[PDB]
Amino acid sequence: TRTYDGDGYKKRAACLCFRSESEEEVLLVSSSRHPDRWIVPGGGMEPEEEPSVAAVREVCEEAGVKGTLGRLVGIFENQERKHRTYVYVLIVTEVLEDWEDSVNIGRKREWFKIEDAIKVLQYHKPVQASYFET
Numbered sequence: 001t002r003t004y005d006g007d008g009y010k011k012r013a014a015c016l017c018f019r020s021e022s023e024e025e026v027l028l029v030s031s032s033r034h035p036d037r038w039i040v041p042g043g044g045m046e047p048e049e050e051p052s053v054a055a056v057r058e059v060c061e062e063a064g065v066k067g068t069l070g071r072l073v074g075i076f077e078n079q080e081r082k083h084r085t086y087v088y089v090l091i092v093t094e095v096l097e098d099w100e101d102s103v104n105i106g107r108k109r110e111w112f113k114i115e116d117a118i119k120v121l122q123y124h125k126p127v128q129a130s131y132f133e134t
């Protein structure tokens with residue numbers, strides 16, 4: 001079940017899934033609609049679900065990783081798609097082989113240097129590119 005803020009924006013959460021504490025490489029996953037494109041893994045908060053809990057859950061489902069949850073980066077609106085995303089740091093400690101979306105929809109995942117992640121997100125996901133601005 002999808003959830004919404006008072007203004008009708010869909011509530012979402014995501015993590016910047018870093019390979020280490022140095023936050024130099026981040027994990028992106030393929031778009032479900034357009035598999036040749038990259039996105040930051042994240043998705044809808046469930047009813048009464050804490051955003052940090054939604055973030056870790058969606059990362060597990062879409063990217064097949066787990067780790068140590070870090071700081072809230074910020075809350076980011078996508079005015080065109082009418083959604084509002086809480087974005088957390090996650091330092092990846094486990095990479096699992098046969099994750100929900102791998103199995104279900106053949107979703108891919110790849111490590112990017114920060115500069116390269118920003119480059120591949122810019123065209124279709126400029127708000128997700130902005131996650132990395134600070």
Ligand SMILES: O=P(O)(O)O[C@@H]1[C@@H](OP(=O)(O)OP(=O)(O)O)[C@@H](OP(=O)(O)O)[C@@H](OP(=O)(O)O)[C@H](O)[C@H]1OP(=O)(O)O
Pocket residue numbers: 002012030031032033034039042043044045058
């Ligand atoms: O699951 P939704 O329908 O609320 O939203 C997904 C939208 O889903 P969210 O991430 O906002 O929510 P869930 O991860 O909980 O499906 C997201 O889907 P996915 O999760 O499959 O990546 C979007 O795809 P993309 O960013 O991968 O191209 C998808 O277009 C978008 O579908 P829409 O209803 O906007 O047609």
Ligand SMILES: [Cl-]
Pocket residue numbers: 018019020021022023024025026
């Ligand atoms: Cl890193």
Ligand SMILES: [Cl-]
Pocket residue numbers: 078125127128
């Ligand atoms: Cl977005």
Ligand SMILES: [F-]
Pocket residue numbers: 043044058061
């Ligand atoms: F989802």
Ligand SMILES: [Mg+2]
Pocket residue numbers: 042043044058061062
């Ligand atoms: Mg999802």
Ligand SMILES: [Mg+2]
Pocket residue numbers: 041042043044058062
């Ligand atoms: Mg999603």
Ligand SMILES: [Mg+2]
Pocket residue numbers: 043044058
């Ligand atoms: Mg979901």
